[PDB]
Ligand SMILES: [Cl-]
């Protein structure tokens with residue numbers, strides 16, 4: 094889709110948005126790599142940090158495939174997002190909600 098793609102937003106700006114207290118665990122957004130790669134930022138919770146944000150680097154295979162882990166690849170970012178919204182499979186939490194505002 095297009096709604097979860099926040100483009101050129103910084104890491105700190107994405108964290109300010111994801112730290113929203115009304116955000117369910119697993120709220121996310123995809124952005125451009127700040128450090129042509131992408132990044133999946135997801136909200137999470139634990140007692141030590143409270144609400145926090147995890148950042149996953151979306152890498153590209155030399156053959157043309159998007160991936161975060163070393164056993165799963167996707168033909169597009171939409172397919173990657175669809176996959177992780179159904180299965181956590183290595184991520185802190187599965188994707189549950191597109192980040193508001
Ligand atoms: Cl980054």
Ligand SMILES: [Cl-]
Nearest residue numbers: 128148149150
């Ligand atoms: Cl990173």
